[PDB]
Amino acid sequence: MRVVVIGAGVIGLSTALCIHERYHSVLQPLDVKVYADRFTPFTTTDVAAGLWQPYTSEPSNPQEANWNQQTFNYLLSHIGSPNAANMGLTPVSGYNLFREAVPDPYWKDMVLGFRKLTPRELDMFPDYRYGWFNTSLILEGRKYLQWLTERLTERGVKFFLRKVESFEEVARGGADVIINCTGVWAGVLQPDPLLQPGRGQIIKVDAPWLKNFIITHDLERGIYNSPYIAPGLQAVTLGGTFQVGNWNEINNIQDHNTIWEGCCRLEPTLKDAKIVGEYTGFGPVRPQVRLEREQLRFGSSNTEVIHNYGHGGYGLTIHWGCALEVAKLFGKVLEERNL
Amino acid sequence: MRVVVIGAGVIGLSTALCIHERYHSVLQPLDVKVYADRFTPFTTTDVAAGLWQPYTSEPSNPQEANWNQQTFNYLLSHIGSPNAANMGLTPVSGYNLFREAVPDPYWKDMVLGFRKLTPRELDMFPDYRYGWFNTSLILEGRKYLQWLTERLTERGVKFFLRKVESFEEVARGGADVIINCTGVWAGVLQPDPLLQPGRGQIIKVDAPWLKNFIITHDLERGIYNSPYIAPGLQAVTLGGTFQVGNWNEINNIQDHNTIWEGCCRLEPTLKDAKIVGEYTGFGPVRPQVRLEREQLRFGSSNTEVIHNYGHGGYGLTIHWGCALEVAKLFGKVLEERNL
Ligand SMILES: Cc1cc2nc3c(=O)[nH]c(=O)nc-3n(C[C@H](O)[C@H](O)[C@H](O)COP(=O)(O)OP(=O)(O)OC[C@H]3O[C@@H](n4cnc5c(N)ncnc54)[C@H](O)[C@@H]3O)c2cc1C
Ligand SMILES: Cc1cc2nc3c(=O)[nH]c(=O)nc-3n(C[C@H](O)[C@H](O)[C@H](O)COP(=O)(O)OP(=O)(O)OC[C@H]3O[C@@H](n4cnc5c(N)ncnc54)[C@H](O)[C@@H]3O)c2cc1C
Ligand SMILES: N[C@@H](c1ccccc1)c1ccc(Cl)cc1
């Protein structure tokens, strides 16, 4: 076959690798290209802290807790390999703070050492009156993308810089299968106004004395409109804003003062952390992940398409579940085609 | 008053500020001097990884457990300061690992969120069957010595770089009180067959991705002769030698490999850490602390000695208690002359 993957973010490259691991032999050669107008370090994936943690409450699609679980277990299996940290993978422990007592999350027994905070702990945090502690994982976006681009190149997957204009023009290029992995920009190739953009600003600092994460939660304001501190491999991610339907790609100063004041509130040692950079990304926000097979018929050419977009603010936390599931749908295509 | 504090380790310098805090207003001539033949970075205090944890066993003495507790609550008080990290202070989370089960430590309720390690956690560590998890504090000796000398200097304490050959010489020099904070070399000033050297080799590596300290215990081998990993503010301490009685300050090739292989078995990501330095020091190992008053007279000059040494492999952890205690004993000495 001639396979083409559109997108080189986490969801792109992970999905391209999951396929090629499962469906390629020396006697059964496969040809995967990867098309993309942004590669690392310039993707939305590169911008994300990389902490493994789904959302507080239940999920509307219960496939998506299962994809979350499969991703955690795939990741944890690499903890203790010599290469973990070369994938961008390190364990980390932290706090989730709240203004009110809330139910436990469904993932409580997926993570390591989940528990409620003590009174003493809650005085480290004067503005908060309930929380949790747990150990989890940092899968750093920029590093995992580097790791994947390498593992994928040893297996002869070729790379092309190119802004695709429509699925049409990829069918005419002579493509049997298209894997669509464009996160927030899939609503250009084929309309979908259920896909809004999630606009998050982060500040990256040198504050190497911070080893725990700290996530605040304001339930009114919704996910990631409330201070967070995530240690990384080489630097620390301050964040705090997540505006849905805002398309502005510039950094802007309100978001800065909001992330800086609220994060200093939390960890006042930050007055001496030097700022390394400021960044803005767009979440592929969608009420459910669009992961499904679709046949198309572009004038002359018939094509086979699988979408993998709309992972919102949880693409790293779920990617490998999604990536596996795609290769299923790809398998079923191969069953019809006698190969 | 003329006070000469011998020693500029954590013990001397903390004791010295403790004193001058409690008594510069209410003693109109109060003159304090620090004599020492090593200042930071050449003390044993500078080799210490900096973690607050006592010995796993019960204490040798009820007073010591209180001093460890006083020190903990004191340091914790500064958590939340803007200047925590310029003191050398940041919180840290981590694991203690055993080859067999063992009882809870007496300090389990002093530290934050202490618990037993679950089965999944223990698969993360295949050469161990039991352990704890908890949150405690890094107090980096090197930063903290620095903070102490600044505060002392603000307050007008004077430092001298010199060898004290005897208590006699200091006494005839004008010393009313002498605080003896000489650590492992205290025996030189007045024999002590109980006080011997716990020799420890360590390796500083650059491995910013390790966030959690890891301490192993083989009870056959005695305490801290067993790989440990300790993240600092700016580097990571690898060690696991505490050979009592050895005075050899040259680094030895045997101990390097023991620390290196053993730490690499523990965190295999260490294959990629850059080695930054390798150093040896001597804990003042002694069945219990020597902290007590002693009068000595030479000719016609009576002089009050107060000892404060023998803190072994947990000096940072105990330091503040002791110093308060010595401030209390100084307190007596004053009232026995009427202020
Ligand atoms: C501030 C912030 C913090 C976050 N933190 C976390 C976190 O801690 N944990 C977590 O799990 N998730 C987090 N996320 C979510 C995460 O960033 C995304 O879910 C994930 O990166 C999406 O991957 P993607 O491949 O779908 O999108 P992207 O990374 O943006 O990749 C899209 C790719 O498709 C390409 N493409 C798009 N349009 C076209 C076109 N027309 N032609 C050709 N190529 C095209 C792009 O150029 C790019 O290569 C965060 C997001 C933000 C903004
Ligand atoms: C490898 C290693 C790791 C450790 N890790 C930890 C840890 O994680 N946590 C913890 O709590 N503890 C730890 N310790 C223990 C800690 O380092 C000691 O308990 C502490 O340093 C003792 O402080 P001190 O002032 O007694 O000794 P030192 O810091 O050695 O200072 C003694 C001072 O006295 C001076 N002096 C001595 N004799 C004379 C003389 N004749 N004339 C003039 N000056 C003199 C010296 O010059 C020096 O200034 C560790 C020790 C080692 C070796
Ligand atoms: N008691 C500390 C020690 C270690 C070796 C030698 C002497 C003392 C120590 C240092 C670091 C960590 Cl992680 C745990 C304990």
CATH level-1 class of the largest domain in chain A: Alpha Beta
Tell me the CATH topology of the largest domain in chain A: Rossmann fold
Strand composition percent of chain A? 25-35%
- By CATH, the architecture of the largest domain in chain A is named 3-Layer(aba) Sandwich
Q: Specify the helix fraction band of chain A.
A: 25-40%
The span between the termini of chain A is 9 Å
Description:
- The structure is a homodimer of 339-residue chains.
- The first copy, chain A, is an alpha/beta fold and 339 residues long.
- Chain A folds into two domains: 1-88 and 140-195 and 286-339, NAD(P)-binding Rossmann-like Domain (Rossmann fold); 89-139 and 196-285, 2-Layer Sandwich (D-Amino Acid Oxidase, Chain A, domain 2), CATH 3.30.9.
- Chain A has nine helices and 15 strands.
- In chain A, strands 3, 4, 5, 8, 9, 10, 11, 12 and 13 form a nine-stranded mixed sheet that branches. Chain A has a six-stranded mixed sheet with strand order 6-2-1-7-15-14.
- In chain A, helix 1 packs parallel to helix 5, helix 1 crosses helix 9 (315-336) and helix 3 (63-78) crosses helix 9.
- The structure holds flavin-adenine dinucleotide (2 copies) and (S)-(4-chlorophenyl)-phenyl-methanamine.
- One flavin-adenine dinucleotide is lined by residues 6-12, 35-38, 43-45, 47-51, 163-164, 181-183, 185, 188-189, 200, 202, 239, 281, 283-284, 309, 311-317 of chain A.
- One flavin-adenine dinucleotide (FAD) is lined by residues 6-12, 35-38, 43-45, 47-51, 163-164, 181-183, 185, 188-189, 200, 202, 239, 281, 283-284, 309, 311-317 of chain B.
- Chains A, B: It comes from Sus scrofa (Pig).
- Chains A, B: It catalyses: a D-alpha-amino acid + O2 + H2O = a 2-oxocarboxylate + H2O2 + NH4(+); D-alanine + O2 + H2O = pyruvate + H2O2 + NH4(+); D-cysteine + O2 + H2O = 2-oxo-3-sulfanylpropanoate + H2O2 + NH4(+); D-dopa + O2 + H2O = 3-(3,4-dihydroxyphenyl)pyruvate + H2O2 + NH4(+).
